[PDB]
Design an enzyme around this catalytic site. Structure first.
Site, PDB file in Angstrom:
ATOM      1  N   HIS A  61       0.833  -1.207   0.000  1.00 59.89           N
ATOM      2  CA  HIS A  61       0.000   0.000   0.000  1.00 59.89           C
ATOM      3  C   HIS A  61       0.866   1.255   0.000  1.00 59.89           C
ATOM      4  CE1 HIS A  61      -2.416  -3.091   2.163  1.00 59.89           C
ATOM      5  NE2 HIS A  61      -3.276  -2.754   1.213  1.00 59.89           N
ATOM      6  N   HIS A  91       6.206   6.580   6.938  1.00 57.30           N
ATOM      7  CA  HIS A  91       5.760   6.222   5.607  1.00 57.30           C
ATOM      8  C   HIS A  91       5.169   7.492   4.973  1.00 57.30           C
ATOM      9  CE1 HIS A  91       2.223   5.907   8.154  1.00 57.30           C
ATOM     10  NE2 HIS A  91       1.561   6.353   7.101  1.00 57.30           N
ATOM     11  N   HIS A  93       2.140   9.107   1.936  1.00 55.32           N
ATOM     12  CA  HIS A  93       0.994   8.986   1.034  1.00 55.32           C
ATOM     13  C   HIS A  93       1.228   9.949  -0.122  1.00 55.32           C
ATOM     14  CE1 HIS A  93      -1.410   6.931   4.259  1.00 55.32           C
ATOM     15  NE2 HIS A  93      -0.608   7.655   5.018  1.00 55.32           N
ATOM     16  N   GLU A 103      -3.245  13.450   2.731  1.00 50.76           N
ATOM     17  CA  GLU A 103      -4.469  12.992   3.380  1.00 50.76           C
ATOM     18  C   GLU A 103      -5.122  14.174   4.086  1.00 50.76           C
ATOM     19  OE1 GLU A 103      -3.369   9.263   5.483  1.00 50.76           O
ATOM     20  OE2 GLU A 103      -4.386   8.455   3.694  1.00 50.76           O
ATOM     21  N   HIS A 116       4.143  10.569   7.334  1.00 50.56           N
ATOM     22  CA  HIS A 116       3.623  10.262   8.666  1.00 50.56           C
ATOM     23  C   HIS A 116       4.717   9.595   9.494  1.00 50.56           C
ATOM     24  CE1 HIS A 116      -0.783  10.332   7.103  1.00 50.56           C
ATOM     25  NE2 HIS A 116      -0.292  11.542   7.403  1.00 50.56           N
ATOM     26  N   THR A 195      -5.444   6.104   9.238  1.00 51.14           N
ATOM     27  CA  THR A 195      -6.124   6.470   7.988  1.00 51.14           C
ATOM     28  C   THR A 195      -6.191   5.281   7.044  1.00 51.14           C
ATOM     29  OG1 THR A 195      -4.165   7.236   6.776  1.00 51.14           O
ATOM     30  CG2 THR A 195      -5.257   8.863   8.174  1.00 51.14           C
ATOM     31  N   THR A 196      -5.717   4.121   7.500  1.00 49.10           N
ATOM     32  CA  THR A 196      -5.871   2.886   6.748  1.00 49.10           C
ATOM     33  C   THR A 196      -6.591   1.867   7.645  1.00 49.10           C
ATOM     34  OG1 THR A 196      -3.772   2.037   7.476  1.00 49.10           O
ATOM     35  CG2 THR A 196      -3.784   3.165   5.371  1.00 49.10           C
TER      36      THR A 196
END
Ligand SMILES: Nc1nnc(C(F)(F)S(N)(=O)=O)s1
Ligand SMILES: [Zn+2]
Length: 256
Positions: A61, A91, A93, A103, A116, A195-196
């Site tokens: 992901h 990690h 996004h 996000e 993050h 958020t996942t």
């Protein structure tokens, strides 16, 4: 299982994870005119001088850069936090285009990416117990805009070709996350969630106001990663962001 595509993306997650429609979901839009300055906020302390990176992994992901969290080596304290939170991984996004990828949004503005840094409350002893607590995690989020290169990011950019596909990992020692921080530690903070999936409501979010700049070429290498495993048809890893969720009369507090 879950992903970011039309058939398994954010609008579908609530069927396996009903908390997706919860009272304190993340991310959110940060309305800067409505966030209120909070004098009760203590100053933020980021102590990463002892950080010990170990490895980088493509998890299907995103990619995770993992730290040794078996001792107080790199910690976040102060700000809205009570106690000590230990760094376990960071990690990102990011988007398919420079106008999307973050996000959190700021007055509905989307950045090209969001970093993050994930930390867990040491009073709960380990990460898997901490995510079951309302104050178990603290995530430091940092927006990325496209512009000048970020020198401290290049060692990450450098290794991505060795973890192109899902489940690949590479050694990643002696990486210094201090090289990813902007000058200012001014922040916004609110209670929210992962958020996942599993979208657990365990996170104190601390979102820095100041973005870092990265180059077009750096983000382009992010976008060469793969959601798929080796030997499968290429699905570029892009747009792995969850959109803004309803605030539900939480209040966003500002440190400045
Ligand atoms: N990769 C991921 N690692 N952590 C993730 C999270 F869901 F917990 S986040 N985006 O920090 O809330 S995404
Ligand atoms: Zn994240």
């Amino acid at each position: 299982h879950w992903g970011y595509g039309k058939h398994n993306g954010p609008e579908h997650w609530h069927k396996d994870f009903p908390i997706a429609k919860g009272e304190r979901q993340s991310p959110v839009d940060i309305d800067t005119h409505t966030a209120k300055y909070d004098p009760s906020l203590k100053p933020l302390s980021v102590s990463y001088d002892q950080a010990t990176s170990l490895r980088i992994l493509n998890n299907g992901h995103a990619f995770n850069v993992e730290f040794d969290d078996s001792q107080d080596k790199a910690v976040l304290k102060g700000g809205p936090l009570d106690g000590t939170y230990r760094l376990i991984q960071f990690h990102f996004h990011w988007g398919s285009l420079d106008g999307q990828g973050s996000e959190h949004t700021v007055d509905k503005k989307k950045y090209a990416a969001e970093l993050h840094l994930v930390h867990w409350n040491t009073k709960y002893g380990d990460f898997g117990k901490a995510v079951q607590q309302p104050d178990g995690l603290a995530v430091l989020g940092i927006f990325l805009k496209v512009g000048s290169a970020k020198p401290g990011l290049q060692k990450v950019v450098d290794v991505l070709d060795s973890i192109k596909t899902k489940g690949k990992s590479a050694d990643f020692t002696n990486f210094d996350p201090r090289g990813l921080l902007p000058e200012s530690l001014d922040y916004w903070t609110y209670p929210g969630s992962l958020t996942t999936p599993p979208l657990l409501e365990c996170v104190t979010w601390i979102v820095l106001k100041e973005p870092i700049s990265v180059s077009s070429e750096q983000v382009l290498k992010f976008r060469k990663l793969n959601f798929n495993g080796e030997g499968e048809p290429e699905e570029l890893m892009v747009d792995n962001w969850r959109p803004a969720q309803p605030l539900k009369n939480r209040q966003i507090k500002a440190s400045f």
